[PDB]
Design an enzyme around this catalytic site. Sequence first.
Site, PDB file in Angstrom:
ATOM      1  N   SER A 230       0.800  -1.278  -0.038  1.00 17.77           N
ATOM      2  CA  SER A 230      -0.075   0.195   0.016  1.00 17.77           C
ATOM      3  C   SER A 230       0.910   1.313  -0.110  1.00 17.77           C
ATOM      4  O   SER A 230       1.692   1.489   0.822  1.00 17.77           O
ATOM      5  CB  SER A 230      -0.892   0.153   1.287  1.00 17.77           C
ATOM      6  OG  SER A 230      -1.577  -0.976   1.131  1.00 17.77           O
TER       7      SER A 230
ATOM      8  N   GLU B 209      -1.390  -1.005  -4.207  1.00 18.70           N
ATOM      9  CA  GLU B 209      -2.828  -0.399  -3.778  1.00 18.70           C
ATOM     10  C   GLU B 209      -2.199   1.100  -3.437  1.00 18.70           C
ATOM     11  O   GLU B 209      -1.343   1.319  -2.735  1.00 18.70           O
ATOM     12  CB  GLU B 209      -3.026  -1.195  -2.482  1.00 18.70           C
ATOM     13  CG  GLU B 209      -4.446  -0.245  -1.967  1.00 18.70           C
ATOM     14  CD  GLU B 209      -4.796  -0.979  -0.681  1.00 18.70           C
ATOM     15  OE1 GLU B 209      -4.324  -1.003   0.239  1.00 18.70           O
ATOM     16  OE2 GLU B 209      -6.192  -1.338  -0.501  1.00 18.70           O
TER      17      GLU B 209
ATOM     18  N   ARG C 181      -3.424   4.091  -1.567  1.00 16.80           N
ATOM     19  CA  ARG C 181      -4.339   4.343  -0.439  1.00 16.80           C
ATOM     20  C   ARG C 181      -4.681   5.863  -0.533  1.00 16.80           C
ATOM     21  O   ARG C 181      -4.073   6.836  -0.135  1.00 16.80           O
ATOM     22  CB  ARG C 181      -3.905   4.151   0.662  1.00 16.80           C
ATOM     23  CG  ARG C 181      -3.998   2.635   1.165  1.00 16.80           C
ATOM     24  CD  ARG C 181      -5.424   2.508   1.546  1.00 16.80           C
ATOM     25  NE  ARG C 181      -6.162   3.087   2.684  1.00 16.80           N
ATOM     26  CZ  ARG C 181      -5.920   2.987   4.034  1.00 16.80           C
ATOM     27  NH1 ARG C 181      -5.128   1.817   4.321  1.00 16.80           N
ATOM     28  NH2 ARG C 181      -5.974   3.912   4.856  1.00 16.80           N
TER      29      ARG C 181
ATOM     30  N   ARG D  29     -10.293   4.301   1.249  1.00 14.03           N
ATOM     31  CA  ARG D  29     -10.764   3.763   2.549  1.00 14.03           C
ATOM     32  C   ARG D  29     -11.703   4.829   3.292  1.00 14.03           C
ATOM     33  O   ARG D  29     -11.130   5.908   3.456  1.00 14.03           O
ATOM     34  CB  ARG D  29      -9.793   3.149   3.745  1.00 14.03           C
ATOM     35  CG  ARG D  29     -10.354   2.578   4.757  1.00 14.03           C
ATOM     36  CD  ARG D  29     -10.677   1.165   4.206  1.00 14.03           C
ATOM     37  NE  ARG D  29     -10.082   0.170   3.440  1.00 14.03           N
ATOM     38  CZ  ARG D  29     -10.367  -0.349   2.111  1.00 14.03           C
ATOM     39  NH1 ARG D  29     -11.522   0.123   1.709  1.00 14.03           N
ATOM     40  NH2 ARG D  29      -9.794  -1.433   1.722  1.00 14.03           N
TER      41      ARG D  29
ATOM     42  N   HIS E 123     -13.996  -4.291   6.510  1.00 12.33           N
ATOM     43  CA  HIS E 123     -13.052  -4.491   7.804  1.00 12.33           C
ATOM     44  C   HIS E 123     -13.884  -4.305   9.230  1.00 12.33           C
ATOM     45  O   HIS E 123     -14.781  -3.739   9.160  1.00 12.33           O
ATOM     46  CB  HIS E 123     -12.126  -3.276   7.745  1.00 12.33           C
ATOM     47  CG  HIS E 123     -11.106  -3.100   6.611  1.00 12.33           C
ATOM     48  ND1 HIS E 123     -11.430  -2.879   5.341  1.00 12.33           N
ATOM     49  CD2 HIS E 123      -9.669  -3.702   6.937  1.00 12.33           C
ATOM     50  CE1 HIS E 123     -10.149  -2.928   4.688  1.00 12.33           C
ATOM     51  NE2 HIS E 123      -9.411  -3.494   5.725  1.00 12.33           N
TER      52      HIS E 123
ATOM     53  N   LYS F 181     -13.100  -9.403  -0.275  1.00 11.94           N
ATOM     54  CA  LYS F 181     -11.843  -9.159   0.890  1.00 11.94           C
ATOM     55  C   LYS F 181     -12.392  -8.822   2.013  1.00 11.94           C
ATOM     56  O   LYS F 181     -13.241  -8.061   2.292  1.00 11.94           O
ATOM     57  CB  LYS F 181     -11.030  -7.952   0.061  1.00 11.94           C
ATOM     58  CG  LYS F 181      -9.806  -7.920   0.945  1.00 11.94           C
ATOM     59  CD  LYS F 181      -8.988  -6.513   0.578  1.00 11.94           C
ATOM     60  CE  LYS F 181      -8.817  -5.517   1.880  1.00 11.94           C
ATOM     61  NZ  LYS F 181      -8.277  -6.338   3.010  1.00 11.94           N
TER      62      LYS F 181
ATOM     63  N   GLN G  98       2.635  -5.582  10.878  1.00 11.26           N
ATOM     64  CA  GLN G  98       3.052  -5.973   9.509  1.00 11.26           C
ATOM     65  C   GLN G  98       4.144  -6.791   9.430  1.00 11.26           C
ATOM     66  O   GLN G  98       4.942  -6.726  10.371  1.00 11.26           O
ATOM     67  CB  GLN G  98       3.191  -4.570   8.792  1.00 11.26           C
ATOM     68  CG  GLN G  98       1.998  -3.869   8.089  1.00 11.26           C
ATOM     69  CD  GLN G  98       1.586  -4.521   6.612  1.00 11.26           C
ATOM     70  OE1 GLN G  98       1.972  -6.025   6.584  1.00 11.26           O
ATOM     71  NE2 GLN G  98       0.728  -3.885   5.889  1.00 11.26           N
TER      72      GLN G  98
HETATM   73 CL    CL Z   1     -17.932  -2.021   4.810  1.00 12.06          CL
END
Ligand code: CL
EC number: 4.2.1.10
Lengths: 255, 252
Positions: A30, A55, A57, A91, A152, A179, A239
Amino acid sequence: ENLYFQSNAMKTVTVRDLVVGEGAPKIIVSLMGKTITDVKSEALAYREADFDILEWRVDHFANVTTAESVLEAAGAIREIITDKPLLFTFRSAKAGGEQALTTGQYIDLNRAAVDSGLVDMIDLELFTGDDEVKATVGYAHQHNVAVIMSNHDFHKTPAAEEIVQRLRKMQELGADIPKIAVMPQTKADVLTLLTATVEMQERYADRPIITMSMSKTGVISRLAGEVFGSAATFGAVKQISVADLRTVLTILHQA
Amino acid sequence: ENLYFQSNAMKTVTVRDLVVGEGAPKIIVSLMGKTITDVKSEALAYREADFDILEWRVDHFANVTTAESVLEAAGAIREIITDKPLLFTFRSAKAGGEQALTTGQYIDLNRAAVDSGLVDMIDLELFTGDDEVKATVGYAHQHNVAVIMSNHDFHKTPAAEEIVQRLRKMQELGADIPKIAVMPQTKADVLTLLTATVEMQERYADRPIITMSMSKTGVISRLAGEVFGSAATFGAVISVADLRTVLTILHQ
Ligand SMILES: [Cl-]
């Protein structure tokens, strides 16, 4: 020029020559940059790393409400990372994102990304609004842009069947790749996420899925995708590190 | 000389300076030589590999019924690999072992290993017979030899609660380290073994436990012991090098 394929029987999605759902899980990194200057430097640093999907962000980008600025940044990334799929992900604030946009703005942002031809995939959140998500998925597909749908839970791990149902709903809405990421509170919670992964992949999926149990306790969920059925995993450049992630995935892929 | 320690605080067993149950899981490698020349060549080949415990699979040894031959071979191994705990394991026929012994011969073999002073640990099978196990556990402890108690299912994975109850029974019988290995028939079976590992660790364990789901499908059970609660894993010289690589990454 964007082009993707997908096979329901093989449960794969092929984007910019990368076959997601075949072989060892793919590594997603990301990119987070506040300004165009940061985005350009980060893309250069990332070029030196061994990953499969980039990705972006977008919610970390200060000038996200300026369409021209977003287009400029996307183009800058694409100039550096020319041969890997680029996933555009704003996001939302509701989903833990760094800034807020109304639903309409979020949808328009994603449509603008599709129109640009600079990104191979977009991320749409499960609870965005089903009618707008369906319309946007169709628009993406008409322009050869694949869709990852995401959900999430940063505080807990829902029951296995609830995780499964959310992944099924993402399929139902047209996601090319469902996902989900959940947070374990106990060791058993990590196993719950793996159980949902297996059940989804074996019984209901006709495409690749990506699943993760967050935190140090859930790291094993980032490594065991080949056996349990998660098609990709996130690693850090700066991570678990991308280098360590590839080392382990390679070990587990050996016949 | 043989001596071991154990603690129910951090649930550890310390044998020849190795703290089983602390940090990253320990790597066990097995010696499977038929003759003393095979045993010596294998021990010499393993000397430089990065592992923690050497298991001698005595059921692969052709002269297992000759007491002097067993003692000679144990000495030969001890001479070559001097800095690592030696685990004496006769895998019985019922448990998938290469040769058959009467209960009586099996118990006497293990007692002789304890008496030799050449081995740090012995492996005893859970279903050997309770009276025999208790007596042999007591005998081993009298001589400062630790006991790994084992159970295997090479064809299927029992229910989680059954796995937990077997591990608990091993603790009750006095095992210093309960050990179980089961065969998955599905991916969920692998998760069943991990679930039992976690449940045992939180509900009943007061010592290290070793658990494994066999086959390529169950490989994650060999890697994830630090988080789920398995204290050791087997590799061969997945390779020992790859196993250490992954365990070290997960310990970070
Ligand atoms: Cl959602």
